[PDB]
Write an enzyme that holds these catalytic residues in place. Sequence first.
Site, PDB file in Angstrom:
ATOM      1  N   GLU A 277      -4.049  -1.508 -40.983  1.00 41.98           N
ATOM      2  CA  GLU A 277      -3.070  -2.563 -40.748  1.00 41.98           C
ATOM      3  C   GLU A 277      -2.380  -2.398 -39.396  1.00 41.98           C
ATOM      4  O   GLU A 277      -1.944  -1.305 -39.040  1.00 41.98           O
ATOM      5  CB  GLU A 277      -1.970  -2.563 -41.823  1.00 41.98           C
ATOM      6  N   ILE A 278      -2.307  -3.485 -38.638  1.00 42.86           N
ATOM      7  CA  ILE A 278      -1.575  -3.480 -37.378  1.00 42.86           C
ATOM      8  C   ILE A 278      -0.677  -4.685 -37.615  1.00 42.86           C
ATOM      9  O   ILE A 278      -1.121  -5.834 -37.503  1.00 42.86           O
ATOM     10  CB  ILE A 278      -2.461  -3.726 -36.153  1.00 42.86           C
TER      11      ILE A 278
END
Lengths: 335, 335
Positions: free
Chosen positions: B222-223
């Site tokens: 996840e970014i």
Amino acid sequence: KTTMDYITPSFGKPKACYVTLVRNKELKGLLSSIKYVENKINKKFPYPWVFLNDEPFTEEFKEAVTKAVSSEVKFGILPKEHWSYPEWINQTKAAEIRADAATKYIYGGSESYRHMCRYQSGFFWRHELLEEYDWYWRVEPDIKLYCDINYDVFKWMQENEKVYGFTVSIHEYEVTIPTLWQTSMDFIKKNPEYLDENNLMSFLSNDNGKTYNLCHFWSNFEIANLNLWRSPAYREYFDTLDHQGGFFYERWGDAPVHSIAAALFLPKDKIHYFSDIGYHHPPYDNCPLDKEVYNSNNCECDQGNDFTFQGYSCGKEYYDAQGLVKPKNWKKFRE
Amino acid sequence: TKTTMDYITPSFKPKACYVTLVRNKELKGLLSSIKYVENKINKKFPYPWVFLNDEPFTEEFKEAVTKAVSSEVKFGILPKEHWSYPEWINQTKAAEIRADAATKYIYGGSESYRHMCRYQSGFFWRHELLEEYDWYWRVEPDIKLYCDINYDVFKWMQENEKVYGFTVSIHEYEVTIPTLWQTSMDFIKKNPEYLDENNLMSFLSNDNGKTYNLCHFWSNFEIANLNLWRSPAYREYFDTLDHQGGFFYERWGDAPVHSIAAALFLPKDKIHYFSDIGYHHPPYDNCPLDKEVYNSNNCECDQGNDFTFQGYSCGKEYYDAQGLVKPKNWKKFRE
Ligand SMILES: *[C@@H]1O[C@H](CO)[C@@H](O[C@H]2O[C@H](CO)[C@@H](O[C@@H]3O[C@H](CO[C@H]4O[C@H](CO[C@H]5O[C@H](CO)[C@@H](O)[C@H](O)[C@@H]5O)[C@@H](O)[C@H](O[C@H]5O[C@H](CO)[C@@H](O)[C@H](O)[C@@H]5O)[C@@H]4O)[C@@H](O)[C@H](O[C@H]4O[C@H](CO)[C@@H](O)[C@H](O)[C@@H]4O[C@H]4O[C@H](CO)[C@@H](O)[C@H](O)[C@@H]4O)[C@@H]3O)[C@H](O)[C@H]2NC(C)=O)[C@H](O)[C@H]1NC(C)=O
Ligand SMILES: *[C@@H]1O[C@H](CO)[C@@H](O[C@H]2O[C@H](CO)[C@@H](O)[C@H](O)[C@H]2NC(C)=O)[C@H](O)[C@H]1NC(C)=O
Ligand SMILES: Nc1nc2c(ncn2[C@@H]2O[C@H](COP(=O)(O)OP(=O)(O)O)[C@@H](O)[C@H]2O)c(=O)[nH]1
Ligand SMILES: Nc1nc2c(ncn2[C@@H]2O[C@H](COP(=O)(O)OP(=O)(O)O)[C@@H](O)[C@H]2O)c(=O)[nH]1
Ligand SMILES: [Cl-]
Ligand SMILES: [Cl-]
Ligand SMILES: [Cl-]
Ligand SMILES: [Cl-]
Ligand SMILES: [Mn+2]
Ligand SMILES: [Mn+2]
């Protein structure tokens, strides 16, 4: 002449090979696996490596593989008859099952994946390139060998009279094999002589065979005697499964098939768990829990992620069935 | 009033960090992941790395980690209130649930796993160490980054005003989240203002929300913009889930939780798929399908094993919901 009678003869160097069924587009992951096998055992105890593909291997694939393997390599294409629908299978029915299961479970909609499972169940062991051998060690791409292996495993299997060797066990997704157990139990009722009196049924069932607990040995890692698959017992079991249709109307994997057979057709002391071989096949590990073995063999895995005793694995079931003393902290893995 | 996006636009070098929840016994796999992140992006675009653990990190751990990361590292322990049963959960009921589910699904009998899921769902974004940042990049042990990354990704998210970035999507095992969808739809029914008029409901449902198709983004990669989880909408959503009981009475993962929120509470153009970032989290890959991208960034994965468009993956569902044109060869992945 029982099943074991077909195996005991093979009990001065064992006739063995590594065997790999693989696709051209998986070259990078295969090269990585080869590097692990080479550094961990193959440089020490060389054995020929058999590579199989349902399509022909490219020259790029062969050049890279030949260069990466230090012992003898052999490339083979498999017969159309071992990778195609049988005449008794309804393809329209098979196609609908695929479409409907596309998003239901892994490989649910895959046509090629089912041909692969059928292949690993009833044909890889009679490919022309494996006939001169008695033993095989299956290797898949994207695998890791976390530790050194300092003894010839085939030699070991031979001297100790073991037939089937494995590292990872697990519970199968039932939606994948709804009628496999029923089909297998009917086979045994019809052929009582094939059920060994000292079989490993308790690994497969908690209710004396009535139902399947779904436990099986992971097939990506196998070091076994080809004479088991070649026995009348196994040949007839596969043919029964083939005619029932589960490979195509459901999604029968070769792993539960090989396992049910090994566990039912053999005296249980012919099956062996390599607690000493560090191995990873995404997403699970077999990491040696014995500290002396872990350290002496310079294992590169985190003991803390060994899957063996985790609830969804079948390590506990295997240990209890074999009467093996489980390691001291085995319960930590159920936390 | 003040909408969900009103809480995020202000944050549009950005204040960002990598964030890793991890165990002491996963050191070798952690160091492996670190080497990948270092080599593919962090030595070029350095950003602080935060490491979290429900237990204290050992000196052996911090030493190895501090040396392996080229940018600044921060080690934190979790507040016990973010990793323990809330007062309203019936622990005997939960213990029975676990004992029964032990062999039923992955992590079925695990107690720690559920606290981890609840942690990633409602607390990692509240840890003291993340307070000063607006963006995080989640990284887990035993991960691979197949290609070089030649741009600062946080910077890119900021300049392009994106909120949630991912790489792998997949169908959840419904047995782990039987009442999650119903709980979420009731939340939306009572809070219609948190439903963005231009959201990605179509990624989660095939029938306008009547039922869940089980699709979610894999949370191991996840970014995203922390302010999303920090918004009133998400806080209220997490609180609703927390009191319903599913994290402990079922086995709610943070990935489905993060995904339902992102797909329902944001305008869909705020969610982004990193088709250019090669990644592996056992057992699936996201491998750049664009040739120029694959070659320019010297990708190390087999394009042929990209999971994105496989049936069980939700990349198809994702592209169709966003109106993104799928690559020409997407169907080959459905063979
Ligand atoms: C090889 O395998 C083949 C695949 O299974 C098989 O094909 C046939 O199987 C059976 C055999 O008869 C057929 O079953 C009948 O189906 C009728 C409905 O047909 C329509 O719906 C089908 C199912 O759709 C669902 O699945 C689809 C895919 O999985 C999915 O896309 C869809 O959304 C849905 O979920 C569908 O497959 C059919 O598609 C075909 O026809 C379409 C329209 O013409 C066409 O566009 C498409 O391309 C296909 O060609 C149809 O759309 C049922 O109505 C029927 O049920 C009645 O009869 C049975 C008979 O015993 C009764 O038991 C039952 O109660 C029903 O009776 C009531 O109604 C009658 C009507 O008067 C009444 O008299 C009675 O009193 C009752 O009230 C039955 O289930 C199946 O349709 C066939 N499939 C195909 C694709 O051909 C072959 O048989 C196999 N070959 C061999 C040699 O075995
Ligand atoms: C908490 O969970 C326990 C464990 O299930 C509940 O125990 C009861 O469960 C059943 C009642 O619904 C019956 O079997 C018994 O009354 C009892 N079971 C036993 C002996 O453990 C208990 O009711 C729950 N308590 C709360 C908070 O409602
Ligand atoms: N030649 C060939 N090999 C295949 C095919 N599908 C799978 N395999 C091989 O069969 C083994 C099992 O396949 P894999 O995709 O790893 O399946 P999984 O272990 O269930 O995820 C691997 O060695 C693959 O390379 C196929 O269509 N053709
Ligand atoms: N500190 C800590 N981290 C944990 C624990 N369980 C899982 N994690 C971390 O949570 C992330 C997801 O856990 P993992 O076991 O990989 O779950 P999976 O991705 O579902 O297989 C990884 O970063 C782990 O290291 C735990 O009990 N304590
Ligand atoms: Cl055919
Ligand atoms: Cl799939
Ligand atoms: Cl607690
Ligand atoms: Cl488990
Ligand atoms: Mn595999
Ligand atoms: Mn993980």
